[PDB]
Coordinates of C-alpha atoms in Angstrom, one line a residue:
Chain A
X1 CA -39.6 174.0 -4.2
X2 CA -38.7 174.7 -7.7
X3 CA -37.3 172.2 -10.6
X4 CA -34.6 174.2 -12.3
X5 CA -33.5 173.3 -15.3
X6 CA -32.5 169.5 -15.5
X7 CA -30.7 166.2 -17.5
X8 CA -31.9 165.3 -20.8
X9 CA -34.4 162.7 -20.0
X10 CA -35.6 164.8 -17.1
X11 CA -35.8 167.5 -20.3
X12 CA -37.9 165.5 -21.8
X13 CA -40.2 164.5 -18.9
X14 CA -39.9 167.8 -17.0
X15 CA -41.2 169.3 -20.2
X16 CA -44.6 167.1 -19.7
X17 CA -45.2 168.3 -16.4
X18 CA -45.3 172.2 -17.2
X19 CA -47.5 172.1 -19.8
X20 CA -49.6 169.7 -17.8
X21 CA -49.4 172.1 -14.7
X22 CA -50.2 175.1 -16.1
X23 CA -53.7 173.3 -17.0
X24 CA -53.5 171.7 -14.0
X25 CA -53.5 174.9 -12.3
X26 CA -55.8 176.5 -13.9
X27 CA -59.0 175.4 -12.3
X28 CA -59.7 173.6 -8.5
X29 CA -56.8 171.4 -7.8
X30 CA -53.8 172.7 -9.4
X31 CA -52.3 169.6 -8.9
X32 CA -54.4 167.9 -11.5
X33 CA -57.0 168.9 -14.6
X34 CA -60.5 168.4 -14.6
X35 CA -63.3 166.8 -16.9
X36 CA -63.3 170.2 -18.6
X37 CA -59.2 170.5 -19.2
X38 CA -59.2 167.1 -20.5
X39 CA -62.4 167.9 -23.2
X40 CA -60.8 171.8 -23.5
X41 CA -57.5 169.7 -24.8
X42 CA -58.9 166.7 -26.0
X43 CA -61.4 168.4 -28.3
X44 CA -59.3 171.8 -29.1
X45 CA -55.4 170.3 -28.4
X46 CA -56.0 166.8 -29.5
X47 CA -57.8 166.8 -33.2
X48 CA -54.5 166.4 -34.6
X49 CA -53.3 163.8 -31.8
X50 CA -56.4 161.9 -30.7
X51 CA -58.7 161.6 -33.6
X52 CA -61.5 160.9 -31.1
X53 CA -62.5 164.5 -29.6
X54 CA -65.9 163.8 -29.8
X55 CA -66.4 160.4 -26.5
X56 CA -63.7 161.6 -24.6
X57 CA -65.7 159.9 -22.1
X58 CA -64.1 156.9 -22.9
X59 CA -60.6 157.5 -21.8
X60 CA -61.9 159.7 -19.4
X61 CA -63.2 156.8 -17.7
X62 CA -60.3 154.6 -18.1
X63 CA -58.0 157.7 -16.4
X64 CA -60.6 158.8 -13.9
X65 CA -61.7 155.1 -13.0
X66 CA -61.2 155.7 -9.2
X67 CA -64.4 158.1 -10.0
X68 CA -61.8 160.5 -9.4
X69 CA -62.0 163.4 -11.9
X70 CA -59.2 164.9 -11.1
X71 CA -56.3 163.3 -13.7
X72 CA -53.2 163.1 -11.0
X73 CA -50.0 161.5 -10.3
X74 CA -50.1 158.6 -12.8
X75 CA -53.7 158.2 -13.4
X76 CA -53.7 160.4 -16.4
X77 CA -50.7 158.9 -17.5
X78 CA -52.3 156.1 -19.4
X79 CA -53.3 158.8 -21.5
X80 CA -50.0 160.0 -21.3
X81 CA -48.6 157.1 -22.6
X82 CA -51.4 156.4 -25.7
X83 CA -50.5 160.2 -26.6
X84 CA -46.8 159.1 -26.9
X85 CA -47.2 156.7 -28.5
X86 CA -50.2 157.4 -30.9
X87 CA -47.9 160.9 -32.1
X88 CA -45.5 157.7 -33.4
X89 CA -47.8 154.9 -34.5
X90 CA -51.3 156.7 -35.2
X91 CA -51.5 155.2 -38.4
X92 CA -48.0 155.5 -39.1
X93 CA -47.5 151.8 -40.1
X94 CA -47.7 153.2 -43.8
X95 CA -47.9 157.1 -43.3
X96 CA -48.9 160.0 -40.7
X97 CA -46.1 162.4 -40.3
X98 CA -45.6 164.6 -43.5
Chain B
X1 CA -76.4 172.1 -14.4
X2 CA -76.4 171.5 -10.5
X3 CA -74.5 174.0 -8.9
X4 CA -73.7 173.4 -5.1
X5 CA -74.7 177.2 -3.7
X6 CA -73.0 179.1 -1.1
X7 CA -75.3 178.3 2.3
X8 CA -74.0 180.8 5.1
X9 CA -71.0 182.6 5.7
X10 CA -69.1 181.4 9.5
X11 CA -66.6 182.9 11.1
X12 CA -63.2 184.5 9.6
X13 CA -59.9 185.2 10.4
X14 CA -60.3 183.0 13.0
X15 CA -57.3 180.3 13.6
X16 CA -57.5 176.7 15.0
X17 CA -55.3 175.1 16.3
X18 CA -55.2 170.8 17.4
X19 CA -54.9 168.9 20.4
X20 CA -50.7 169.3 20.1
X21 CA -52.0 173.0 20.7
X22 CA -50.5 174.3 17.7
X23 CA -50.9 177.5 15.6
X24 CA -51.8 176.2 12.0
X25 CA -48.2 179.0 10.7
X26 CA -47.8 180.0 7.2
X27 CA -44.3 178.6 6.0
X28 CA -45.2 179.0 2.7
X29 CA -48.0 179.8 -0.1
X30 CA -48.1 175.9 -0.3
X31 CA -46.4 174.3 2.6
X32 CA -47.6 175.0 6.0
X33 CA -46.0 173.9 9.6
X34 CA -47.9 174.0 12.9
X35 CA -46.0 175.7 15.6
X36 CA -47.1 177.6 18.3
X37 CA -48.0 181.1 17.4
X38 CA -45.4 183.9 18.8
X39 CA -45.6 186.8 16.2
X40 CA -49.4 186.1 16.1
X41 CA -50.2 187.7 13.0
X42 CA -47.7 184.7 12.2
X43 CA -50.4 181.9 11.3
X44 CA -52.9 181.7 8.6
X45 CA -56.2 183.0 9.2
X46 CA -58.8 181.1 7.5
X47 CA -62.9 181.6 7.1
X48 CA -65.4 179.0 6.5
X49 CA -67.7 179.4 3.6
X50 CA -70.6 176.6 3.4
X51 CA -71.7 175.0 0.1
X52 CA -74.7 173.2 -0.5
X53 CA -74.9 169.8 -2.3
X54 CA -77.0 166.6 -0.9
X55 CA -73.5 164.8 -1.5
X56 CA -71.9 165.8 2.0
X57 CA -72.2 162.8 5.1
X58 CA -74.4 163.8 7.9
X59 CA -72.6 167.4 8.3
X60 CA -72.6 170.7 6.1
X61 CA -69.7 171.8 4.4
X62 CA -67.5 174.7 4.2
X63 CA -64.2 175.8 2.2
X64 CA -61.5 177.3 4.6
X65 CA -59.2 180.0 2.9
X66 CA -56.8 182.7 4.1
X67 CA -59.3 186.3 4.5
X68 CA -57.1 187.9 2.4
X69 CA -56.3 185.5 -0.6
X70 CA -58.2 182.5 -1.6
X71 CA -55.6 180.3 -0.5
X72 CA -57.3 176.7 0.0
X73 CA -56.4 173.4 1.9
X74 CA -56.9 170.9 -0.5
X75 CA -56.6 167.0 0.0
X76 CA -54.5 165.5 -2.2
X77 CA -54.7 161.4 -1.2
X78 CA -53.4 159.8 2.3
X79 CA -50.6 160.9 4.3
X80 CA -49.9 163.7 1.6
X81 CA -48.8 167.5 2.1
X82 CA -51.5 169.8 1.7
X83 CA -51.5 172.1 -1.5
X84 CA -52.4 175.3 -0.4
X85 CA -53.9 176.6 -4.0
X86 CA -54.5 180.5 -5.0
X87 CA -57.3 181.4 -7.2
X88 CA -58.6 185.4 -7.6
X89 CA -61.9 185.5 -5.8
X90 CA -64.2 183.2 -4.4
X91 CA -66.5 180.6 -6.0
X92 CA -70.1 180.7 -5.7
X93 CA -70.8 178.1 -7.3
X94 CA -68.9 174.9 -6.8
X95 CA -68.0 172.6 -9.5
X96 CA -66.3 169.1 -9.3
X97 CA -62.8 170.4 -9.8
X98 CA -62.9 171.8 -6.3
X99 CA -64.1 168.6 -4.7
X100 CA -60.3 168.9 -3.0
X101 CA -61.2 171.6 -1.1
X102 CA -64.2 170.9 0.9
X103 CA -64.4 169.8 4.2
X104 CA -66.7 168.1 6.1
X105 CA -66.9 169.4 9.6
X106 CA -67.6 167.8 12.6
X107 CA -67.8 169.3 15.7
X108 CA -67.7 168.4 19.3
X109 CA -68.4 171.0 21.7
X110 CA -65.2 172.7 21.4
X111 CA -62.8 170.5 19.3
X112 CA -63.5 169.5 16.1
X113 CA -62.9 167.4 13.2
X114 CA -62.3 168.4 9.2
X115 CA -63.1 165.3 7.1
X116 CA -62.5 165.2 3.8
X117 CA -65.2 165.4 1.3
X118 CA -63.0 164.1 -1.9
X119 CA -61.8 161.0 -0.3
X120 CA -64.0 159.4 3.2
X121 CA -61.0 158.3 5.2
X122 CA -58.9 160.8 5.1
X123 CA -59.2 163.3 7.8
X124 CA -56.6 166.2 8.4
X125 CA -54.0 165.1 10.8
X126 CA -51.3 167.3 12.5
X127 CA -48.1 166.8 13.3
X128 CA -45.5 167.9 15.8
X129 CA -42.0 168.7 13.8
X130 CA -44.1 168.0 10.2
X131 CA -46.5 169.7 8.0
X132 CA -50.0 169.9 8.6
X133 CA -51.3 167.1 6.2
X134 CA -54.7 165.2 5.8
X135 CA -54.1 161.3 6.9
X136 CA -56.1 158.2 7.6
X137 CA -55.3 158.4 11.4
X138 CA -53.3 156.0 13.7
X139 CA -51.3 157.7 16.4
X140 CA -52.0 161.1 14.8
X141 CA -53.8 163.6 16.3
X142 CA -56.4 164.5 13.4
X143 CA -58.4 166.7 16.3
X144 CA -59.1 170.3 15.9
X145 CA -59.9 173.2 18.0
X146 CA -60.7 176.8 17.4
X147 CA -58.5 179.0 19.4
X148 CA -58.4 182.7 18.3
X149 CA -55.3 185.5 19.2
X150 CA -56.2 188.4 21.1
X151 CA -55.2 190.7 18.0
Chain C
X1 CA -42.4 161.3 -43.4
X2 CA -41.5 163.8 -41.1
X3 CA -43.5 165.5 -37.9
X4 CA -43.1 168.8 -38.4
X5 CA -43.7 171.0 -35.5
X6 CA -46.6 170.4 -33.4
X7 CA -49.9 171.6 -31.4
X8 CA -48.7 171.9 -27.4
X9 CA -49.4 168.7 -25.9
X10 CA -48.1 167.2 -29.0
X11 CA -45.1 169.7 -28.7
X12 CA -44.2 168.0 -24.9
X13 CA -45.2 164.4 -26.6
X14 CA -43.1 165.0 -29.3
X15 CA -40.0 166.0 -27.6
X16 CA -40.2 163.0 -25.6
X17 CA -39.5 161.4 -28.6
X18 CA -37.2 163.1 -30.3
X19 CA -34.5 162.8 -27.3
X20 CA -35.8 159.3 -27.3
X21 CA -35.0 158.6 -31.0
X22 CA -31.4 159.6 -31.0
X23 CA -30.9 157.2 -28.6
X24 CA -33.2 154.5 -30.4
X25 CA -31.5 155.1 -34.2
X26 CA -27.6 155.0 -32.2
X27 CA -27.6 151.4 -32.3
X28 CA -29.8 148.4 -34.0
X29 CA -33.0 149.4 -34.5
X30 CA -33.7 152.9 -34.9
X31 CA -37.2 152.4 -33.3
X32 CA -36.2 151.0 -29.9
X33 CA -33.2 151.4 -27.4
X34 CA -31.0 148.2 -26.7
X35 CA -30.0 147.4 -23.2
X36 CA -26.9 149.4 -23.5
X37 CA -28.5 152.6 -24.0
X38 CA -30.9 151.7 -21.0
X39 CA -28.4 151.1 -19.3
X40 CA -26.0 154.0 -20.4
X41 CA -29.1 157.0 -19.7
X42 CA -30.2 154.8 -16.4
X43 CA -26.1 155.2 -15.4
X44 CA -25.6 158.1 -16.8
X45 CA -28.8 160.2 -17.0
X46 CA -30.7 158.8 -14.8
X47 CA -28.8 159.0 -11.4
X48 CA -30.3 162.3 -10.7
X49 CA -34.2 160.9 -11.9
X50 CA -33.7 157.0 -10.9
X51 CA -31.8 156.9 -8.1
X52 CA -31.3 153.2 -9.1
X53 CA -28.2 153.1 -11.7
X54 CA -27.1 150.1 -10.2
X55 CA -29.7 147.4 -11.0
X56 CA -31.3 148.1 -13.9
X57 CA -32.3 145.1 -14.3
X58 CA -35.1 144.9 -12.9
X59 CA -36.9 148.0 -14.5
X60 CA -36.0 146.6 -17.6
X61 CA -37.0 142.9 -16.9
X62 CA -40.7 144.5 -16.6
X63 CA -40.0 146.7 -20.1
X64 CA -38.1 143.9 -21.8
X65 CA -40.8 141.2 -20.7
X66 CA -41.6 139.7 -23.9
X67 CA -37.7 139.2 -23.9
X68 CA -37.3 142.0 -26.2
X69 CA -34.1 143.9 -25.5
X70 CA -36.1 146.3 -27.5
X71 CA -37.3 149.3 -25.7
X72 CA -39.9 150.0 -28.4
X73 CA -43.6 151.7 -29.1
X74 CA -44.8 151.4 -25.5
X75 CA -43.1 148.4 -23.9
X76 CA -40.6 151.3 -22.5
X77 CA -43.2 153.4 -21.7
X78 CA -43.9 151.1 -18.7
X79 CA -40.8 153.3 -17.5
X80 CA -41.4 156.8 -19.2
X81 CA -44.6 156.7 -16.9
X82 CA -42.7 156.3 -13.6
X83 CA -40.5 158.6 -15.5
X84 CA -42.4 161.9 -15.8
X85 CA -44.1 160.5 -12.4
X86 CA -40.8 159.9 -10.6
X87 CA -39.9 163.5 -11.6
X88 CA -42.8 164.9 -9.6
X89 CA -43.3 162.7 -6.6
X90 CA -40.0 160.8 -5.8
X91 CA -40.3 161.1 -2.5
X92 CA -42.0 164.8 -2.9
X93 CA -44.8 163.8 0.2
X94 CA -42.5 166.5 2.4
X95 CA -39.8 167.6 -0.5
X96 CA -37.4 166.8 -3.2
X97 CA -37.6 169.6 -5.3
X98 CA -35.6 172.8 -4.6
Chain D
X1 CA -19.6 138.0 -23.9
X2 CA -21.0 135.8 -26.3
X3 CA -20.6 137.2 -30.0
X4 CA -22.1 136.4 -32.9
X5 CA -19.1 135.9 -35.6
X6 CA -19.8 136.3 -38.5
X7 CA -19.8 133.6 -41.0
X8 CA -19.4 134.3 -44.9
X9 CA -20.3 136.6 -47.7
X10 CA -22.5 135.5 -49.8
X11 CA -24.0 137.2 -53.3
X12 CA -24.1 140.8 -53.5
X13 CA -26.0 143.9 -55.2
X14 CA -28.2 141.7 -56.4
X15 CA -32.4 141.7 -56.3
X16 CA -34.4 139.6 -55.4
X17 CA -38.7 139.8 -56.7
X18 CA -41.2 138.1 -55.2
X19 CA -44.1 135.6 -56.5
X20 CA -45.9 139.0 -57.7
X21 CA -42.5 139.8 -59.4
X22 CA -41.9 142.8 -58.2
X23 CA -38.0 144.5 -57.8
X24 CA -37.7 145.8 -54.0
X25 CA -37.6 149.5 -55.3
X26 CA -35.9 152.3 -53.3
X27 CA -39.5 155.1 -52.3
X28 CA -37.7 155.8 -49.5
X29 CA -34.5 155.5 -46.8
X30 CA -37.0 154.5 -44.2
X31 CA -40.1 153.3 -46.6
X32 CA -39.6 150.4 -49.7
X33 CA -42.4 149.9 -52.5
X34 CA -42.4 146.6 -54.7
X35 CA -42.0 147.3 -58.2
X36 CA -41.4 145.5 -61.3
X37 CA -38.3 147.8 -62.1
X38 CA -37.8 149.7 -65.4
X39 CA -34.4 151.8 -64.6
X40 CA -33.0 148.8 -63.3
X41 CA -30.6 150.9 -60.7
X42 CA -33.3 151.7 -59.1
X43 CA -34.4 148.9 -56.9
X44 CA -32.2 148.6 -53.4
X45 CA -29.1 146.4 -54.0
X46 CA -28.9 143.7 -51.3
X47 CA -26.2 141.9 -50.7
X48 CA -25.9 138.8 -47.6
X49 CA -23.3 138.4 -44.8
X50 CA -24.5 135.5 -42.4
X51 CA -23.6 135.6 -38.7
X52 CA -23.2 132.5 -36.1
X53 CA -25.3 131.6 -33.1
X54 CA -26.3 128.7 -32.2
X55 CA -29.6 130.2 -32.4
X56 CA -30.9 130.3 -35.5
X57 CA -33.6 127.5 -36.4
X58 CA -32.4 124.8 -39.0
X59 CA -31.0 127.7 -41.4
X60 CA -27.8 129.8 -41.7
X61 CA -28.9 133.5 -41.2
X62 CA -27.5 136.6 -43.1
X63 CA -28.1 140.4 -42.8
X64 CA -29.3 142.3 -45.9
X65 CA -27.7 145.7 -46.2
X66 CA -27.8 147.7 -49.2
X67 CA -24.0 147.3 -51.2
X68 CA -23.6 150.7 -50.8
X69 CA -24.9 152.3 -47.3
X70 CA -25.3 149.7 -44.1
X71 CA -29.1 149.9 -44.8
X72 CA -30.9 147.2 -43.2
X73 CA -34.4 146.2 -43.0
X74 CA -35.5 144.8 -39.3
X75 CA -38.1 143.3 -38.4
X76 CA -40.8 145.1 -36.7
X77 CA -44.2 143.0 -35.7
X78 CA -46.9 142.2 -37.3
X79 CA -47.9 143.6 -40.5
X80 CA -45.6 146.9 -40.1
X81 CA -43.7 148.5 -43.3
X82 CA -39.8 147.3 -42.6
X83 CA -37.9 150.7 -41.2
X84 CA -34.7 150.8 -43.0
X85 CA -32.4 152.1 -40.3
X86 CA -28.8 153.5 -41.6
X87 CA -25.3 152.8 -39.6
X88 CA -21.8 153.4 -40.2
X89 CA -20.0 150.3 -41.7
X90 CA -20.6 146.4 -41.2
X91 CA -20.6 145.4 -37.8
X92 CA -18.7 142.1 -37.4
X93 CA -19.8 141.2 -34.1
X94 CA -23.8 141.0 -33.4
X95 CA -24.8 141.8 -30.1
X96 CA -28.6 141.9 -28.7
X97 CA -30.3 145.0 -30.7
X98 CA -29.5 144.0 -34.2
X99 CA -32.2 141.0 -33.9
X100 CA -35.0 142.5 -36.3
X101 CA -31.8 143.1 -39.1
X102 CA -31.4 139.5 -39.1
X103 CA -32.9 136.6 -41.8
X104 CA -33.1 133.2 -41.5
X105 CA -33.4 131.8 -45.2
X106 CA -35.4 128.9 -45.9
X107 CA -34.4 128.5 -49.7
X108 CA -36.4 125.5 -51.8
X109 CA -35.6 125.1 -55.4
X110 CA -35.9 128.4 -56.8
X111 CA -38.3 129.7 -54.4
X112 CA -36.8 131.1 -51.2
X113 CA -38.7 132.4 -47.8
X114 CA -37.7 135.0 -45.2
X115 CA -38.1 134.0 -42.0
X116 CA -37.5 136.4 -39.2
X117 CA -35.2 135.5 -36.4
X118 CA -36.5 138.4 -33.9
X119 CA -40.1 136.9 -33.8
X120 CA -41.2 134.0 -35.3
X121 CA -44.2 134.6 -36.9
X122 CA -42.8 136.8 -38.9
X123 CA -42.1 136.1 -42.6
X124 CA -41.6 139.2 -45.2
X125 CA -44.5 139.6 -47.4
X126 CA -45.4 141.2 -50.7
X127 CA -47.9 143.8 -51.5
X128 CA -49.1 144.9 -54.8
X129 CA -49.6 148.4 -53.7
X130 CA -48.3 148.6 -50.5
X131 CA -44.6 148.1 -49.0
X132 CA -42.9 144.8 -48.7
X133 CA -43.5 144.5 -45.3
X134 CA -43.3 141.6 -42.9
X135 CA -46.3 139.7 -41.9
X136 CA -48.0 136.5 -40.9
X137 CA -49.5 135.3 -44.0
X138 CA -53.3 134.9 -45.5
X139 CA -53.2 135.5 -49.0
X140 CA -50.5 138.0 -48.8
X141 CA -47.7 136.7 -51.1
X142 CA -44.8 135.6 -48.9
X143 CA -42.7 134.1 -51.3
X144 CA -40.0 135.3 -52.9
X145 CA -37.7 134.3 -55.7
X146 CA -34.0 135.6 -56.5
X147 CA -33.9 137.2 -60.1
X148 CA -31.1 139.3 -61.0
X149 CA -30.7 142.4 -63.6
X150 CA -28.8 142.5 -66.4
X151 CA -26.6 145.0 -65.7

């Protein structure tokens, strides 16, 4: 019941998941975070990445929208995906990364 | 904020076991097989501790975890495997992350039913060669009795 | 012009695209895989994740959709979604991980 | 498969300014400011090599590539800065991933356009502060014009 070490995408997306879990497991349900690990990363993690820490409600909402705060298996991966992508094109269509 | 506070202790170390008649037998600290007890002190033993928020159904609600550890049922969504979850010492005050591992009990003279609180239709479910999961339930028996060992 | 190392969920975001990249600047375009490299990682990399190295097709039909061979900022991430998904719950409802 | 062959070398290391008149100067391997240049080798030296599909519009389509290095600027979408990606010596055979690398010249008079053959809407625009970047165009000055240095 353990992922050992894996292939090179897997190394990329395996990598996800144990930062993730060790949120994840932090509080109830160690199998997703909660309303307060998303503000905990989005306001003390995410400054640099999501330059919205402030109405995390927002995406909160657009993740949790089953009224399910618990950001599982490919709910919170909207966010996911925006963090992917916003590291590359925050404002990076003239400058970000320096 | 609103805290959902700790209403009455039940009973402890107690085991139940379904309609299959079978011992709910720790496999693992997150996987968990029902099987007919035979070593006894072989299954998990679990205690109910009620919580109180005006957010249950009709029925009171209590968290089952192992006496010894706080190991948890939680329901994770359908005809998925329980994750048995360990945290050091017991909540008193119940936030909305552990809205997994509540149960809504309903009970019928001597069997009984654990509902889950997180999501209405899924009720926990046992199998006979499988793990004990949560399920919406067709052909499933998602019935419960208490049965305790003799020691 | 250059992310330097990162905060932690930005440190498993960036990775993903670091791996990613080297892929993405092998052939035209240096921002998005062609579908040769899909193809190569799906074959190659990806018979342990996607068990599905045969038709790739259709995975990237639903990336590609615009009819953009281009794997680019977030029209692949359609896939890196039901990657880092995949990863955890394959067909993890009784085991896959061990 | 079907390849793209391609079709004939045209003019080489020169520079080409646009409306603004302003050399396509070398910030960057990646990032390209427009500049009216004043050490002459200093702006990007271009140079044309046309490849055939049956796919272009009405116009014979070349890739620009600096004389020296395979330097190419693609196409992105939109109003995004041109990424000048770096690879190995000429391809002579095109397949479906060097799209954005690819010009479809629409030359009247003097005056020439840029046309992208990835997406359509594309045409490469010029900045006064900014990067020559591709865009569609409202007063951004998406002309160009072909003027050559002295030496």
């Amino acid at each position: 019941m353990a992922a050992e070490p894996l292939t090179e995408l897997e190394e990329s997306i395996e990598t996800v998941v144990t930062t993730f879990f060790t949120f994840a497991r932090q509080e109830g349900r160690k199998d997703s975070l909660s309303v307060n690990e998303f503000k905990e990363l989005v306001t003390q993690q995410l400054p640099h990445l999501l330059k919205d820490v402030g109405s995390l409600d927002e995406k909160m909402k657009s993740l949790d929208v089953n009224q399910d705060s618990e950001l599982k298996f490919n709910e919170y991966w909207r966010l996911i995906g925006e963090l992917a992508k916003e590291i590359r094109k925050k404002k990076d269509l003239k400058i970000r990364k320096k | 904020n609103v805290k959902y506070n700790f209403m009455r202790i039940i009973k402890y170390e107690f085991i139940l076991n379904d309609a299959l008649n079978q011992s709910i037998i720790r496999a693992n600290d997150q996987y968990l097989t029902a099987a007919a007890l035979h070593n006894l002190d072989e299954a998990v033993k679990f205690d109910m501790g009620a919580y109180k928020s005006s957010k249950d159904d009709a029925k009171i609600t209590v968290i089952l975890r192992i006496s010894k550890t706080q190991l948890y049922v939680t329901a994770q969504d359908e005809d998925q495997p329980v994750l048995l979850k360990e945290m050091p010492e017991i909540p008193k005050t119940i936030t909305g992350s552990e809205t997994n591992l509540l149960f809504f009990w309903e009970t019928h003279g001597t069997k009984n039913y654990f509902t889950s609180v997180a999501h209405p239709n899924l009720f926990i479910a046992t199998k006979q060669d499988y793990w004990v999961c949560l399920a919406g339930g067709p052909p499933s028996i998602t019935d419960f009795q208490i049965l305790e060992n003799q020691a």
